[PDB]
Amino acid sequence: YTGAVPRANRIVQQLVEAGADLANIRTMFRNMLRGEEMILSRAEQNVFLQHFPDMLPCGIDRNSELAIALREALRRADS
């Protein structure tokens, strides 16, 4: 399956593979959607670039299906 939800789950999977702290990523991403750059490891950055290719010059659109799905997935994993 390749909808926004399985894709967001893949992001979370890759983040944990990369040693990320999901609580931290959740906070970082919430701030990204507000417009603040994330402080990421090279590994964490590379995960995000696989899924949000224009992130560095353009930020991430909080209304995009994938950003919504990732917001949801990070919240659910962080409960």
Question: String of b and e for 1-30 (b: at least 16 CB within 10 Å)?
Answer: eeebbebbbbbbebbeebebebeebbebbe
- Looking at beta carbons only, is 47 or 79 nearer to Na ion? 47
* One character per residue 9-38, x = contact with Na ion (rule: CB under 5 A): ------------------------------
* One character per residue 45-74, x = contact with Cl ion (rule: CB under 5 A): ---------------------x--------
Task: Enumerate residues 5-24 that contact Cl ion by CB under 5 A.
Answer: 7
- Helix intervals (H) in the chain: 4-17, 22-34, 42-51, 55-58, 65-77
